[PDB]
Every structure is written in C-alpha cells, then in structure tokens.
C-alpha cells in the first residue's frame, strides 16, 4: 500500500495514475429518508422532485483533471489528435476508523482497530446512477488535498406536488453484497471499456462551403431566375461566385439559442432575465433547461470580440467553490470556435426556404428559420472536451437514440465505470439491561479516512500533419506573476490554495476536411 | 424520468447564466436543489410532431362538433393526402392529468 | 420552390434566381443549398415540364465555357421514379396540430415547410446518370447522417 | 481554399502545402507509371423505379 | 523530454493577428511575388531544466 | 564533484483529518490531527585509500 | 487546558521517496544547516525542503 | 534494526556505519506556499529571490 | 533516380530527405587564376588577401 501519483507515455497508449485522501462522516444518523420538494419555496412547479436519501456514500472521479497535471494535459493536445479510455483499476487502503468523544469543551479523537467499513461496486447497474450529471463530490486536482466523499441519494418518478406514485421504487442498500474493511484490509476492483471512436482533437482548417478547387467552373448548370416573359434562365457557377456551386454536403442542424457577450456590455440589452430567455425542453408537464444544448460555434472569425452563447457553453470554477452567484473573474468560460468549419454560430438563423408556390401572378417568397433539424447529407463536430470536464456518462436505457454522444462532452457508454459506494459501519452504545424489542437508536460516534488510487489506461493517435508552416500550440503566457499575491499559474497561490488560471480543450493542431 | 436523473443532494461544478444586470453583465448562477429544472444535461427527450388531444372518458372536456379528418396529422404524397396515425409514439396521458386524457 | 422549365404561361415574370433558392449559413456568410436532399421533381398527373428551383442536374451536351448557356444546349434530369417514396418537393402539404382543444376552443390545424426526420420514415436516394459523378469523399467529422452525397453517388 | 477570416484574408490555422516535400518519382521517355486501388464495402446504387 | 514539473511551459507557435494574401502571404509561406520568407527566428530552446 | 551525486532523501507526515462534519461540503479539509514522527537512519559508506 | 498529552499511532505512516533521476532542485551542496550532528548520541531535526 | 556507528580498515578500504536519531514535525500546516523577498528591508536589491 | 525531400521520426531519432535542382556554369574561362587584393581600395591594410 503505497502512493503512486504519476504519468506513462508508451507510444501509442498512456498510463495515469494518482493518489488521494479521502474522509467519511456517518450521514444521517444511519437512517433512510424520504425526500420531497414541491417547489413552492423555489422556483416553482418545474422545480419539484421526490426521492431517497441514503446513510452511503461514493467515490467519482469522472472528470479529466483527476487523471491528468495541467503539464500532461499539454504534452497530450500539442502532440496528439485523439484519445479514448481502455481500461481502469481502483484501490482502496489504509482505511482507519475513529470514534469521537466530546467532554464538557475539550473533544478526543481515538482510533479503534476492530470496527469495519463496508463497501461493494455496483457492477449490474441496479441502483439509479447519479454519476454522470457533472455535480460536485470528484477528487481535487491537486493531489495533497483531502476531500470529502458524498452522500448519496437518487429521484424516482414522482406524480403532482413532488409525491411517489405506484411506480416509484425504494432500494435498500444493506441488500446488497459488500466485503468488511478493517485496518489493514484492502478493496480492489478492475475494468474494461467498451469500444468507442476516439475523440476528435483537431481543429478543422477547412470550411464546408470552399471544399472546391477555386480556379475552375462546374459542369453543372443552375437555374438563375426567369426573363420578363417567364423563361427559365441559365448559369454556370464559377470562381467569380463560389456560393452558388452544387454541393455534396450540408452543415450541422440546429435549434436557435439567443448570443450573449461576455466581455463587453455595450453589446448586451440591459436586465435579461436569464430563465427566461433560455432554450428549454417539456416532460410531464413541466419544463427544464436545454443546457448546453446541442453543440454550435459561440463564435467565429471575424464576429466581435466577447462572442458568446447564452447558456451555450460549458463554465467552470477557478477553484473550488460553494458560491451560488461567483463573479466574472473567478470563472473559465470556455470557447469553441474550433467547429466552425462546420457547425454554425448559434444565434446566426440564416438557413432559408421557400414559404410559397409560385405561378404567373404571384412571385416566390422565402423566410429565414430558427429550427433547422437534421437531414440526410449532415455533417457535424461534437464538444470539446477539457481538462475540467466530464469523461464519460451513461447512455439512458431505451429503445432508442441518435447519436450518443452526451452532449456536455465525453464519452457516451453502454455500461460505464459503476458506482463505488461505502459507509461507516454502525456500532450501538451500551444497551439496557432489560430486554427492549426495539430497534436501537443510540450510536457510537465515529468517521473513517483512507486513500484510494485510480490507474487509467488511454489509447492516444500520434498526429501525422505534412503542412510546411508552424502550427498553433498551447502555451504558458503571462507577463509576470506576484509570488506575494498570486504565486504560479497552475499553482498554489499566497493562501495555500491551487487555481485552475485558465480553460484548456483538446483542439490545437489542425487539419482539413 | 429523464429531467431527474442528477443525485438532488448536490450542486453542479458547472456554472450557468443567469442573465444581465441593469448595465448589459452577465450575471452568473450555480444550479443546486432549490433549481433542478437548471441542470446542464447530457440527454434530451424524444422528437415530436404535435398531435391534437382528446378525452375519451369525460365530454366537458372536448369541444362540440369536431371534425376528426380535418383534426388528424397528415402527410402528402403524389399530390394526395394521408393520415399519420397513430404517428411516433407519444405520451398520451401523464401522471397528473386529467382522468381519460387521450 | 416550384419552376417549369417548358412552359413559360406557369412562372411568374422577372423571378431572380439567387433570391429564391434554399441556402445555409456558415461562418457568418450563406451559400447556395443544392440541388439539395433530393425530392420528387414531378409527379403523374402534374402539368407537363414540372420541376425544382436548382432541385435537379442539368448538364451540357457538349463540352463548353458558356456562362449562360441556351435551353436548347442542356440537358435537364427528370426525378419521377421515387415519387412512391418522395413527395413533390413544392408541395408542403403535411399538416400538423397547431392549438390545444378544449370545450369552447376549436381544434386548428396548419401547413408546414418544414419537415424533418423521425423515426420511421423511408427515402429513396438521387439517381445516378451517365454524365454524373461517380463518388464523393465524406467529409471527416464526428457525425454525419445518412451519409450519401446529394448530387449522387458513392 | 482554406479557412479565412473577414475579407478573404488568411488566419491562423490557414494551411500552406508545399507538393515539393512528398515523394515522387521521375519519368523520362520509356517509363511508366502504375497505381492499384480497391474499394471499400458500399451498398449497390438502387436502380429500379417504385411501382407502388 | 521527461520533465515533472507541475506547471505547463512556454512552447513555440504560430502566432499573428492577420495576413493579407494580396500582399502577404502565410507566414513561412510564398508571398504574392512567388518568393519565400523567414518570418522570424526560430532557436532550439523552449523546454526549461533546473540546473 | 559529481555528475551524479547521492539522490536527495524526501520525508514527511501522511496528512490525518480530523472528524468532518455531518453534512457533505465540497471544499478541501483543513482541519487536521496534530502530530509528529521519529525514527533511527544508518549510513554506510564504502571509502578507498592510498596508503 | 495547560497539560499536554503524546499519544502513540500505530496505523499512521510516513512518505518516503528517494528522487533517482534529479527531477527535484537540488539543494544539497550548498553547505547549509541541517546536516547530521558529530556526535552520535544527539537528536535533531530534520530541516524543510524548498527551492 | 539494530545500532552499528563503528569503522573498519580493510587494507585499501575502509568502511564506515553511523547511527543517529531523527525528529520530523509537520511543516506549514501541509502547504505548500510561494516565498519572495524584493531586497529592501534586507540587504537591497541583490537579495532578493523567488521560490516555494 | 526520383524525388523525396521527407522526414521520418523514429524514437530516439529521425531521418531527413531533401532533393534540390542546380546548375553549374562554366568558371574562369577554364582559367586559374592569381588574386590579390592590398586594401587600399577598400578597408585597408586589415583587407589585404591573396589566394587563387
């Protein structure tokens, strides 16, 4: 049982590892609860739920900067365009219990070797997974720190007011297996992914309408209109108008989002109600968001500087945070202009179509629209991914879907890494000496602590480009850096705490269409 | 149900846009219990066509007189006109609605 | 939109082309959609020389640098035998539910154009022609749907 | 064509090739050259008309 | 290069705001006139060691 | 002197928490048991001489 | 209150690691403090590493 | 593990054991933290440094 | 006798190609010849050379 930490780079496949310390507190005094909301205190109607609470707890580690150093994560994405996951291993050890005794102010803290811990995988997806749906609760980045493991809990199908109908289910997590971890015990498990396509980590240097050699005409002819008698009229497309060739190939669907800009406010309308200016998608008779939505550019080459998308990106913390309302300089907004070859800015609603049918007397009409959906002959990007974003999440189990790929980014999996759950082993205080048939409420107090390691296999693709001029790559820029105030970007900073400076995707060298 | 499927304990590390103030600034907000609908999600629901709704059970629900071919979904072909029916599946009733919605 | 490329009494006088046909945006700029995701050009019974506004090939009988070749100089595809599958293409004729019908609220109904994938429908491809392209390359993306080039081909 | 900005003009990531930096290989007068190729798995072209 | 610092670290790369093919060119490119151009000075050392 | 001298010989305590609270928080733990090590280090040196 | 108590931990442990391929600054060699003491039955301190 | 601190002369070589024992406390709070001087409440500017 | 100008990276190392066109006039008249300069001319006395 010893700590690891670190990065191998094998050709065509990378081994990651790390360690961390991790603390477990007894969540609700060993009970069960049920859980409502019926959303009058809250937003409303659209905000209710029902569920359970549960005694347990879980480890998620499902976002990329578990696995990599920011210096990784550039010698990844300067060198390589793809990556996927292969295979996985989890380790947990050195687990210590401890009991906790409080005496007028003064509170001692005891080890105690005999009690247990209990912990299983839930390796046949029986419990709802709640993985997946980008909360709080991973390890932290920065690997000296000590995190707490979240409790869990899950919503089942409600009825009005956030009540349980016939349907919903309560699952007991005692009924399952699960092995006993004392002092010198240790948890072990191993996996292997599924097949899935790399991701794309290019930018494409090509545009979708200019696939054409330049210089030349088409063979093919167009119809440019009629005379003033109503003769249909012909023209030949060529290098003086090259949006007027024939095409093979169309860009990506979309559904409008409203723009937003983030650096400059003269461009904003003053006092937008965010909630209400958003996408949004209806189930059971209420709402919710369409966040981020279906991946289109924020901005493209030319378009004004601070270019963005209302709820269209993904935004992360600098570092870890409870704020419900952070300002603007503790964030990192991400950008994707990398997909504007061929997906389209979002707000943009330029596709046009005819309205009418035309004859001698009345004249065509088209109109712009704001949904376009998808046809055959689409060609499209997914999201990037980052290195504070999500791996992977779990494609839902249904009949159907169309094309899997989860739209806040990653890899979307039949069966993906299952939940690790584990909770403190109850011991009861001292009984009567008269028997009760009750159940016994009293407990001792205590909480366990342990590390755990996480060792990830990954399959990389070497990149090939033979373009003759230099490429743009990642790099550290900053003018300079006050070690009384700020420190080191990417670094541990006055106060003893890591920030995260800046986003950083996958997408740097490029390549054409 | 496929708005639902978060741990309702927990916050998101992701950050969501609240809007602008009285100057044009964005204006930040984290999604937590008190807001699930504000969830960033991977999923989304079925595509739909909307189909017009009818009460078997109960008649104070329905309007008088309707005429049903002239109310159905349809798609041409050939310069001619069919019904689309039943159509792609949707709900025809949730939990809440009023009792023999159809 | 609708054109007949035989009979001039059917259009309207003085249409501009450009203005008229199917376009997508990319990059802040728009580009001509065609001949676009093929539909049925004419159907049995449709008034003679019916067709599609840049909805089909045309091609030259001889080999030429005309800009503006003459009608007598081209020859112009005719798409009918998908019509089983394909609808005319200017016929926008599917109808959908637009309101919520309750007692004293009529049901109504509307025309869209715009119709979309779902699951369940069947298409036919475009054909092919002796004066046609042979292949196209599919573009290297992460999606791509159906992906069959709309001129035609492989 | 490669990716521009505004005006027609080249951006960061537009891409200059240069044909000199692939092999090839030189013919005089009594040379020949030769290239094989095989097709992927397509599915046939449909060539019948709908009766129905 | 097996350096473990935690930090990432300066690399070379292509930057400019524009260029005008009219004129200009692409940067380590042919120009309008069919000439080639070294934009800049390129040296070996980018990667950083302690001593 | 030496290209390659005697490695550099690294120590500290493993970090303890002390008991978390009841409800769950994301932020990192600062509160931890006070404590200290001790231990015995032998060296050998193997040393060659002219006489 | 004023008394202090030591207890012993027999679960705890202690990192070590020796750094083999000069990885780290190198800090040894510029005869500062913190070296073993002459005499063999003194106690001392390890000193903190930084750079 | 056993104490040895003795010496051993052996021809051309010699060999040396030395036992000693060690204290270790826990340095800043388990931080790390950046550490400056700009020279002046020191000697001046040549001083002054920048480190963890 | 055909075109390359390619690189290949292996490793621990990496092979370049590069193929060029010349052309070599006829020098001198077929002539050696004696130079000198004495620097006047030019720089000075630092400038003076001699060679063939």
């Given at each position: 049982?010893?700590?690891?930490?670190?990065?191998?780079?094998?050709?065509?496949?990378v081994?990651t590892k790390?360690?961390?310390?991790?603390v477990?507190p007894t969540?609700?005094?060993?009970?069960?609860?049920p859980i409502?909301?019926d959303?009058t205190?809250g937003?409303?109607?659209?905000?209710?739920?029902?569920?359970?609470?549960?005694?347990?707890?879980?480890?998620?580690f499902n976002?990329?900067?578990?696995?990599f150093?920011?210096?990784?994560?550039?010698?990844?994405?300067?060198?390589?365009?793809?990556?996927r996951?292969?295979?996985?291993?989890?380790?947990?050890?050195?687990?210590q219990?401890?009991?906790?005794?409080?005496q007028?102010?003064?509170?001692?803290?005891?080890?105690?070797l005999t009690?247990?811990?209990?912990?299983?995988?839930?390796?046949?997806?029986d419990?709802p997974?709640?993985?997946?749906?980008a909360?709080?609760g991973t390890?932290?980045?920065?690997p000296?720190?000590?995190?707490?493991?979240?409790?869990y809990?899950?919503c089942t199908l409600?009825?009005?007011?956030?009540?349980?109908?016939?349907?919903?289910?309560?699952?007991?997590?005692?009924?399952?297996?699960?092995?006993?971890?004392?002092?010198?015990?240790?948890f072990?498990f191993?996996?292997?992914?599924?097949?899935?396509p790399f991701h794309?980590?290019?930018?494409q240097?090509?545009?979708?309408?200019?696939?054409?050699?330049?210089?030349?005409?088409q063979?093919?002819?167009?119809d440019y209109?009629?005379?003033?008698?109503?003769?249909?009229?012909?023209?030949?497309?060529?290098?003086?108008d090259?949006?007027?060739?024939?095409?093979?190939?169309?860009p990506?669907?979309?559904?409008?989002?409203?723009n937003?800009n983030?650096?400059?406010?003269?461009?904003?309308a003053?006092?937008?109600?965010?909630?209400?200016?958003?996408?949004k998608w209806?189930?059971?008779?209420?709402?919710?968001?369409?966040?981020?939505?279906?991946?289109?550019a924020?901005?493209?080459?030319?378009?004004?500087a601070?270019?963005?998308?209302l709820?269209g990106v993904?935004?992360?913390?600098?570092?870890?945070?409870?704020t419900?309302?952070?300002?603007?300089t503790?964030?990192?907004?991400?950008?994707?202009?990398?997909?504007?070859?061929?997906?389209?800015?979002?707000?943009?609603?330029?596709?046009?179509?005819?309205i009418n049918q035309?004859?001698?007397?009345?004249?065509?009409?088209?109109?712009?629209?704001?949904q376009?959906e998808?046809?055959?002959?689409?060609v499209?990007?997914?999201?990037?991914?980052?290195?504070q974003?999500?791996i992977?999440?779990?494609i839902?189990?249904?009949?159907?879907?169309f094309h899997?790929?989860?739209?806040?980014?990653?890899?979307?999996?039949?069966h993906?890494?299952?939940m690790?759950?584990?909770?403190?082993?109850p011991?009861?205080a001292d009984?009567?000496?008269?028997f009760?048939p009750?159940?016994?409420?009293?407990?001792?107090t205590?909480?366990s602590?342990?590390q755990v390691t996480?060792?990830?296999?990954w399959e990389?693709?070497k990149e090939?480009?033979?373009?003759?001029?230099?490429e743009v790559?990642?790099?550290?820029?900053?003018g300079?850096?006050?070690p009384?105030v700020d420190?080191?970007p990417?670094?541990?900073n006055?106060?003893?705490?890591?920030?995260?400076?800046r986003?950083?995707?996958?997408?740097?060298?490029?390549k054409?269409?």
């Amino acid at each position: 049982g010893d700590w690891h930490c670190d990065t191998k780079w094998m050709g065509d496949h990378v081994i990651t590892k790390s360690t961390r310390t991790w603390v477990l507190p007894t969540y609700g005094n060993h009970l069960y609860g049920p859980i409502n909301f019926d959303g009058t205190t809250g937003s409303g109607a659209n905000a209710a739920y029902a569920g359970y609470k549960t005694p347990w707890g879980y480890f998620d580690f499902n976002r990329f900067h578990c696995h990599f150093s920011p210096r990784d994560w550039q010698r990844l994405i300067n060198n390589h365009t793809g990556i996927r996951p292969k295979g996985l291993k989890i380790k947990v050890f050195n687990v210590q219990v401890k009991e906790v005794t409080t005496q007028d102010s003064t509170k001692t803290i005891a080890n105690n070797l005999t009690s247990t811990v209990q912990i299983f995988a839930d390796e046949n997806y029986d419990l709802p997974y709640v993985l997946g749906s980008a909360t709080q609760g991973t390890f932290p980045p920065f690997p000296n720190d000590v995190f707490m493991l979240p409790q869990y809990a899950y919503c089942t199908l409600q009825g009005n007011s956030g009540k349980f109908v016939d349907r919903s289910a309560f699952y007991c997590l005692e009924y399952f297996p699960s092995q006993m971890l004392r002092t010198g015990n240790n948890f072990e498990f191993q996996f292997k992914f599924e097949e899935v396509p790399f991701h794309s980590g290019w930018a494409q240097s090509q545009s979708l309408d200019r696939l054409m050699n330049p210089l030349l005409d088409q063979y093919l002819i167009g119809d440019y209109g009629t005379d003033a008698s109503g003769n249909l009229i012909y023209h030949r497309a060529g290098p003086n108008d090259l949006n007027e060739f024939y095409k093979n190939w169309a860009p990506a669907p979309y559904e409008c989002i409203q723009n937003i800009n983030s650096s400059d406010n003269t461009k904003n309308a003053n006092s937008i109600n965010g909630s209400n200016s958003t996408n949004k998608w209806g189930l059971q008779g209420r709402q919710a968001w369409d966040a981020p939505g279906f991946v289109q550019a924020s901005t493209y080459e030319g378009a004004a500087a601070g270019q963005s998308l209302l709820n269209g990106v993904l935004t992360f913390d600098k570092s870890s945070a409870t704020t419900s309302s952070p300002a603007a300089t503790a964030v990192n907004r991400t950008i994707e202009d990398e997909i504007q070859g061929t997906n389209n800015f979002g707000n943009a609603r330029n596709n046009i179509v005819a309205i009418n049918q035309q004859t001698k007397g009345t004249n065509p009409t088209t109109g712009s629209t704001s949904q376009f959906e998808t046809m055959p002959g689409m060609v499209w990007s997914n999201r990037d991914i980052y290195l504070q974003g999500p791996i992977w999440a779990k494609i839902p189990n249904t009949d159907g879907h169309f094309h899997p790929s989860p739209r806040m980014g990653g890899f979307g999996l039949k069966h993906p890494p299952p939940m690790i759950l584990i909770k403190n082993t109850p011991v009861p205080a001292d009984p009567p000496t008269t028997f009760n048939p009750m159940p016994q409420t009293s407990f001792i107090t205590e909480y366990s602590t342990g590390q755990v390691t996480v060792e990830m296999l990954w399959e990389v693709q070497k990149e090939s480009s033979k373009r003759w001029n230099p490429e743009v790559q990642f790099t550290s820029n900053f003018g300079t850096s006050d070690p009384a105030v700020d420190g080191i970007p990417f670094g541990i900073n006055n106060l003893g705490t890591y920030v995260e400076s800046r986003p950083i995707g996958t997408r740097y060298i490029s390549k054409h269409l």
